[PDB]
Design an enzyme around this catalytic site. Structure first.
Site, short mmCIF file in Angstrom:
data_model
loop_
_atom_site.label_atom_id
_atom_site.label_comp_id
_atom_site.label_asym_id
_atom_site.label_seq_id
_atom_site.Cartn_x
_atom_site.Cartn_y
_atom_site.Cartn_z
N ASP A 35 0.92 -1.28 0.24
CA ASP A 35 0.08 -0.08 0.10
C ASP A 35 0.74 1.19 0.02
O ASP A 35 0.80 1.67 1.06
CB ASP A 35 -0.77 -0.06 1.22
CG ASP A 35 -1.89 1.09 1.43
OD1 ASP A 35 -1.95 1.55 0.29
OD2 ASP A 35 -2.62 1.46 2.50
N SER A 199 -0.69 15.51 -11.97
CA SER A 199 -0.65 15.22 -13.76
C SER A 199 -1.35 16.49 -14.16
O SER A 199 -1.41 17.15 -13.42
CB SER A 199 -1.66 13.85 -13.68
OG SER A 199 -2.11 14.15 -15.03
#
Length: 330
Positions: A35, A199
């Protein structure tokens, strides 16, 4: 040193991925959910409330000659999906894919919430976010990667998750045969303890690319792709009959649909998520309403590049002095 371990989807939907991890002496092998959105290595154990164990493999520290109680240390964690777990702490030898750390904090669960009990395939979590998020008190502990870093050939790990197939976590090296083209690296903020990056935009299907900054986290422990409501609406508007369902808890779409791809930007590069990766199947057994793999992050407080996005790429988690992320197509 290096390590290399195969990671395997837990079910036919890729709801999560499990990676075998050796703990203790002699080794006890548990299948952990790696994770990159959390920083605790915790396991089902001989200390877990018996009624909260249902098929998981447990760590038994009393059977490990290298286990030592970390005296006074406790831990307690709550995840974004509302699940939680807590317990005490041992140090022990932990190996992943041939890479060994001695003295790793192994957080032994005394209590786990129902979603953990109900998932017999996940024996615990191995956190790979920054150690500043580790919950052990009163002495915060380091992640497996943080402990291994100095020994690694290069201070990196890579995630290569498969679509409906196994993939690979590598530590200490970048497998140049595992991706196509070049790796595009992008800046990371560690201020929230995550692999947080920005992004450069998105496209839906064959549509034009929209240049827009989307801050979010690279999170292997989250199944889906969670993005701003504007972006998510633009995606689902291209699917006839798709709608946001408050009763189901997100966007659903007709199971008869063919889904468009979704592209996200990494610098000037582009990662394409095929439409099929966005199908999470019937909302309930036999339903013709299917659950979408791109959902709104509104109310979560952060955008999450979960498995839906990451499995479309070869992803480098660069833990150099200034961390960065790398993405390549594959």
């Amino acid at each position: 040193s290096t390590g290399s371990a195969t990671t395997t989807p837990i079910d036919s939907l890729d709801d999560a991925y499990i990676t075998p991890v050796q703990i203790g002496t002699p080794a006890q092998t548990l299948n952990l959910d790696f994770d990159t959105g959390s920083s605790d290595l915790w396991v089902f154990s001989s200390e877990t409330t018996a009624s909260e164990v249902d098929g998981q493999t447990i760590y038994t520290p009393s059977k490990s000659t290298t286990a030592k109680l970390l005296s006074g240390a406790t831990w307690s964690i709550s995840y974004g999906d509302g699940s939680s777990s807590s317990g005490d702490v041992y140090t022990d030898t932990v190996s992943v894919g041939g890479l060994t750390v001695t003295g790793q904090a192994v957080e032994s669960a005394k209590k786990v919430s129902s979603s953990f009990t109900e998932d017999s395939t996940i024996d615990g979590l191995l956190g790979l976010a920054f150690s500043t998020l580790n919950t052990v008190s009163p002495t915060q502990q380091k992640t497996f990667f943080d402990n291994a870093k100095a020994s690694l050939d290069s201070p990196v790990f890579t995630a290569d998750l498969g679509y409906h197939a196994p993939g690979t976590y590598n530590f200490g090296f970048i497998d140049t045969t595992a991706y196509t083209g070049s790796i595009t690296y992008t800046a990371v903020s560690t201020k929230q303890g995550f692999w947080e990056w920005t992004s450069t935009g998105y496209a839906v299907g064959s549509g034009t690319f929209k240049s827009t900054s989307i801050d979010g986290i690279a999170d292997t422990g989250t199944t889906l792709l969670y993005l701003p409501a504007t972006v998510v609406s633009a995606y689902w508007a291209q699917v006839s009959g798709a709608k946001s369902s408050s009763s189901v808890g997100g966007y659903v779409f007709p199971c008869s649909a063919t889904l468009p791809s979704f592209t996200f930007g990494v610098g000037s590069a582009r990662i394409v998520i095929p439409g099929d990766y966005i199908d999470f199947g019937p909302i309930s057994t036999g339903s013709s309403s299917c659950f979408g793999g791109i959902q709104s992050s509104a109310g979560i407080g952060i955008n999450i590049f979960g498995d839906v996005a990451l499995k479309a790429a070869f992803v480098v988690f660069n833990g150099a002095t200034t961390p960065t992320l790398g993405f390549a197509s594959k």
